[PDB]
Nucleic acid binder design. Structure first.
Ligand SMILES: Nc1ncnc2c1ncn2[C@@H]1O[C@H](CSCC[C@H](N)C(=O)O)[C@@H](O)[C@H]1O
Ligand code: NA
Length: 388
DNA sequence: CCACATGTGCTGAA
DNA sequence: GTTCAGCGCATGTG
């Protein structure tokens, strides 16, 4: 037909919310989404990615490919020689081998360069690490000297700089999409972010920066994220593309109520010891009440009402443990529910669960590290491509 | 100075 | 090396 093949490359791919979003809107856009490649070094994310996005993959005990060396078990630090041996000759190895073979996973962003970076990419995503930018963390920032994990942003600089000299203009990626946390626009972080925008300009891209809340995109979650959408300046001229004003979009609201799964055997928290108050609704539609003398960590001390929206799901700690009040009692959102909270569906979760390799906290961790899928759907709906 | 809103986090004992 | 219960304050707006 006039079906357009969309080659997507996901740097820091995680569980592929970018790929999920693209597949969800594909038929409405008359697209056929294709793996150009990916970069993800986190074992659980790689395994989960494969479970969610593979078709007719049959796991089995395999030797780990000898070049798959730069991977991580915790997502922060590289795995030891021992840890690599423990993966070798297991079913888990075949997930890693498959990511390499069928999805062209290059694993470590440091190892990406002009000789292995695919040409003619239609969409290049880079949801780079958020840990050194999050207000919940230590706020180390993204100064180049400090070599932080969020500073892996600057590897994307390196890659683009390298491919600019070797690729033709037309072989460069058509669109780029950045995601990160709200605090990326803070006063200390603004300088670095502006530095990055000038470079994208220098690389021949026109960009717009969006601050988007998931609650405005058919979700029951307060989650404000920064997106930088970039289009290759000549491709903008050829397509006649224009940036839409996505910050004004206000879809119908959604409540926590609307994603909850019924069960007879949930665990409920004993909170009889802790004083509390009435629920109060904030301007953002978060309805919560505090627990007195629960902890000294503020963000841990709230129970949320299911008739409003909930807080930002984080990968770990307080906001990975989201307490909701139901008629059966107060309980945490489950891993399944956390997947739904990030707008993956039940079937994505069942596939990850069915691997029998990812613990419950790890499933929440990778969901917390992801992006609400329908935000990316909305962003990817604005893109235009030439029929050729 | 105050009150309020809110968090893709961190880490050491076991 | 893992793991997660226990732990605080940054970055705002008004
Ligand atoms: N040096 C490195 N090379 C490659 N990937 C890395 C890396 N350091 C961290 N990462 C990965 O970068 C990811 C950022 S999370 C981004 C979320 C993702 N878009 C999703 O859909 O889930 C993490 O999963 C982390 O494991
Ligand atoms: Na130790």
């Amino acid at each position: 037909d006039k079906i357009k093949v969309i080659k997507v490359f996901e740097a820091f791919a995680g569980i592929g919310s970018q790929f999920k979003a693209l597949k969800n809107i594909a038929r409405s856009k008359n697209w056929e989404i294709q793996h150009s490649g990916m970069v993800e070094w986190f074992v659980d994310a790689i395994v989960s990615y494969v479970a969610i996005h593979s078709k007719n993959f049959n796991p089995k005990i395999e030797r780990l490919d000898r070049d798959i060396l730069s991977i991580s078990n915790d997502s922060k630090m590289p795995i030891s020689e021992y840890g690599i041996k423990k993966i070798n000759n297991t079913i888990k190895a075949s997930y890693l081998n498959y990511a390499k073979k069928h999805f062209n996973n290059l694993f470590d962003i440091k190892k990406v360069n002009k000789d292995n970076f695919p040409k003619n990419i239609d969409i290049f995503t880079y949801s780079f690490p958020c840990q050194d930018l999050s207000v919940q963390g230590l706020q180390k920032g993204i100064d180049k000297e400090l070599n932080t994990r969020s500073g892996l942003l600057w590897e994307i600089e390196r890659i683009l700089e390298e491919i600019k000299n070797s690729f033709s203009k037309e072989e460069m990626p058509k669109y780029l999409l950045m995601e990160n946390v709200k605090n990326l626009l803070s006063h200390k972080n603004k300088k670095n972010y502006n530095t990055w925008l000038k470079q994208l300009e220098k690389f021949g891209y026109k960009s717009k920066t969006y601050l988007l809340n998931s609650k405005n995109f058919d979700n029951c979650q307060n989650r404000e994220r920064v997106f930088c959408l970039s289009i290759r300046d000549d491709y903008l001229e050829k397509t006649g593309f224009k940036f839409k004003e996505l910050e004004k979009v206000k879809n119908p609201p959604k409540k926590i109520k609307d994603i909850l799964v019924d069960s007879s055997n949930y665990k409920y928290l004993n909170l009889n010891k802790y004083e509390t108050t009435t629920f109060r609704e904030t301007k953002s539609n978060i309805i919560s009440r505090p627990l007195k003398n629960y902890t000294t960590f503020n963000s841990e001390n709230y129970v949320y009402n299911i008739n409003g929206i909930g807080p930002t799901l984080t990968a770990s700690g307080a906001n990975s443990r989201i307490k909701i009040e139901t008629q059966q009692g107060v309980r945490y959102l489950t891993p399944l529910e956390c997947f739904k909270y990030m707008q993956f569906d039940v079937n994505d979760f069942k596939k990850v669960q069915s691997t029998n390799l990812i613990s419950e906290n790890k499933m929440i961790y990778i969901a917390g590290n992801s992006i609400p899928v329908k935000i990316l759907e909305a962003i990817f709906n604005t893109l235009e491509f030439v029929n050729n």
